[PDB]
Write a protein that binds this ligand. Structure first.
Ligand SMILES: NC(=O)CC[C@H](N)C(=O)O
Ligand SMILES: NC(=O)CC[C@H](N)C(=O)O
Ligand SMILES: [Mg+2]
Ligand SMILES: [Mg+2]
Ligand SMILES: [Mg+2]
Ligand SMILES: [Mg+2]
Ligand SMILES: [Mg+2]
Ligand SMILES: [Mg+2]
Lengths: 443, 443
């Protein structure tokens, strides 16, 4: 209980809060909201504010259906940069059906659903440590994004410098003032690319922070004349952006992946997890990489995984194990990209993990200096399968899987599939310039 | 009441008001005004101010006509901007004849007429909850509007951010801190499109607030290098704008549409009232949808209605019943667009409602699924009539309906048709570029 009804009412008043953002999330991970005047804080709470909950199905809407917003008290945040006529605060909300029950088509209420599965298996927490990467492109005259990069930095370089446009700085600083907890940040591999890493938190809080963070970013960036994009593959020839997800299970407030007396100090619990992840990656990919362009980042030549394997020391492991042990033992899934919706991502991932533990699945041998050089044939002769090559591919595999379809639930699943199938069809029917360069003179 | 003579005179002096706007509306909903120096406040308040009330006719104006301006103390507000050589305030007004009686051709006086009509039927209040949607475009260098939108947001998604322009916010903030009572706001389907929704009120107050809204909007957006418009379909191939009106009747301070032990918890009255809107839609469309361009929004595929029908959950029903009951039990007409003169629309709607209540009309089958596919023929065999395709058609239907004509008033009616027929006549003789593109080389 971070705040209570009164603590918030007291707080709204102590400060000059005048505008309330009741923010949620549609199925495509897009960050939505309905805004009220502070004069509606009461109705807001009391969970009495209604809206067209079909905003959640995204562009595949069809009819208008009324739904309730239920604000999550302990997610109460006051935005800093505000203060014009008054300040602005917010609430992340859970969408309820008009009859009282939570709306099953809501991404957030789904994570919770599967977190009940985790607790019934006997676990207390499922932690996440996101490593979200993003590009900074320059704005032009007419305030339009351009293909020009904010800087020419390389890997863990000393990016932009402490003389203005240091977006990373203000971002990290602003986030820390908003109550976040950052672990560290750094410039990434390509020029004009960045990464800020959050401290670990419980699935929900971590997912909620990832949403805010993206928002916070986009804003500060515009403030500096820049464009932030979390597009996975903005530029052919340059690195893409992914969002590795460090994962851990807890039991009685004790880390469960750690076993000092076992191979790699990794519990049997830990290894079943890895096991399930390997079993389901080619199937949960259409979710952790939800866009067409997500697949342009998933190619040889960069640090992105193109095959299902794990390792503690390799070029592009879809699963990795950081060095830290004990209270910090965790599995890192390095295929997830920032285009992915966190609640859904952690839904399918948490689910594929539990499917390993439930069924004492057996993990394969850790890969190490092989995958990349051995032809897809040699790789294939082993547990080494290629991830889907296109969104259409990822979608077939997804549907085939029963434990992944369950991870969403009939509503979240029907529509996701619908929207993505359109997205692909639009792309497939499209005639790109590249083809005209190739065939228009040659034929 | 709310304000009394001396209360106002105290307010003006203390707040340092120096410029009064005597505000009113013409047939085309356009917002007129005669403006006096604070020093003339007395003359004003004694109902002694005169002006050319033929301004009410709009461009159909032929001869001049001296009329009086009667301020309404309860509509007194002080505009928040202003404060140069002093502050500004307005008074919404009723137009009188030089012989002391209210001028009929005045739309505000017209609704007050049909309202009294309602009371004879023994009703207490007529409530409106409007949801006015608008587009924000950019102003060019010359300060001239362009076809460039203010953002790329969609339905309900949190956009734009709290750093910069954020018109919607600054509008609601101004409205709220200016006496208004807003419920919520949000981004709309099309990029650059926005909607603010106010708490319900009685017809007159609700119509006055709609006229003040538009203004405050138009104003705020201009202040941010933007152009607001309530033009129904500014752009082909994107969503148009509309102003669904949420209607409810009270009897002795109690909602008369509600009824627990009923079906859908809708009272017999409700069912009848609905019945009325059903049989007058095609004949009141010309009023709720007054511009030529209004009918370019009335095309299938964009959430806007096209047939006379009512549902509780459908793609784009002319009428729909939102979830809430009890006090919130209401009928929503989704035909109405912003271009419409709120006073005329509300009066033509109240009138059609009461008519169906008066003559105990039998409401038709609520539409299940599909009015889109179910072709003309079939749609007919189900008593589903199409709205008028063009302003012309709309007029021929309005002119045929005895009760609708009576809702307007001999004067209002005569001049409204006069305007619309010339408006249509122009648009019909115009040779648009589209014709040239399709025909000039073809023939
Ligand atoms: N973290 C990194 O070094 C870059 C990883 C890469 N962006 C994936 O995809
Ligand atoms: N109800 C909505 O928000 C859709 C509005 C849409 N622009 C219309 O014409 O009705
Ligand atoms: Mg559906
Ligand atoms: Mg990194
Ligand atoms: Mg990593
Ligand atoms: Mg005349
Ligand atoms: Mg709307
Ligand atoms: Mg509506």
């Amino acid at each position: 209980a971070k705040y209570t009804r009164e603590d918030i009412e007291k707080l709204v008043k102590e400060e000059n809060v005048k505008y309330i953002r009741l923010q949620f999330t549609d199925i495509l991970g897009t960050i939505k909201n309905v805004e009220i005047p502070v004069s509606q804080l009461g109705k807001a709470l009391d969970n009495k504010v209604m809206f067209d909950g079909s905003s959640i199905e995204g562009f595949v809407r069809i009819e208008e259906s009324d739904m309730y917003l239920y604000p999550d008290l302990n997610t109460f945040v006051i935005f800093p940069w505000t203060a014009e006529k008054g300040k602005v605060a917010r609430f992340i909300c859970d969408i309820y059906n008009p009859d009282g029950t939570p709306f099953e088509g809501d991404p957030r209420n789904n994570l919770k659903r599967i977190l009940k599965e985790m607790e019934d298996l006997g676990f207390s927490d499922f932690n996440l440590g996101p490593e979200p990467e993003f590009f900074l492109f320059k704005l032009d005259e007419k305030g339009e994004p351009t293909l020009e990069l904010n800087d020419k930095g390389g890997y863990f370089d000393l990016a932009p410098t402490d003389l203005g446009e240091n977006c990373r700085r203000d971002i990290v600083l602003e986030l820390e003032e908003m109550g976040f907890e950052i672990e560290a940040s750094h410039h990434e591999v390509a020029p004009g690319q960045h990464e800020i890493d959050f401290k670990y938190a419980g699935a929900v809080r971590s997912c909620d922070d990832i949403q805010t963070f993206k928002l916070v970013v986009k804003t500060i960036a515009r403030k500096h004349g820049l464009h932030a994009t979390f597009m996975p593959k903005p530029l052919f020839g340059v690195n893409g952006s992914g969002m590795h997800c460090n994962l851990s299970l807890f039991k009685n407030g004790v880390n469960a992946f750690f076993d000092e007396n076992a191979d790699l100090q990794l519990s049997e619990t830990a290894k079943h997890f890895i096991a399930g992840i390997v079993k389901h990656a080619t199937s949960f990919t259409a979710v952790t990489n939800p866009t067409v362009n997500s697949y342009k980042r998933l190619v040889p030549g960069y640090e992105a995984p193109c095959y299902v394997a794990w390792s503690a020391q390799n070029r592009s492991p879809l699963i990795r194990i950081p060095a830290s042990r004990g209270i910090s033992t965790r599995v890192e899934v390095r295929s997830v990209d920032p285009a992915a919706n966190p609640y859904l991502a952690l839904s399918v991932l948490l689910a594929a993990g539990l499917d390993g533990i439930k069924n004492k699945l057996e993990a394969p041998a850790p890969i190490d200096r092989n995958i990349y050089v051995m032809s897809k044939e040699e790789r294939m002769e082993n547990g080494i399968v290629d991830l889907p090559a296109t969104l259409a591919e990822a979608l077939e595999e997804f549907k085939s899987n029963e434990v992944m379809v369950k991870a969403l639930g009939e509503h979240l699943f029907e529509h996701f599939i619908e929207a993505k199938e359109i997205e692909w069809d639009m792309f497939r029917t499209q005639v790109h310039p590249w083809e005209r360069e190739q065939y228009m003179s040659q034929y």
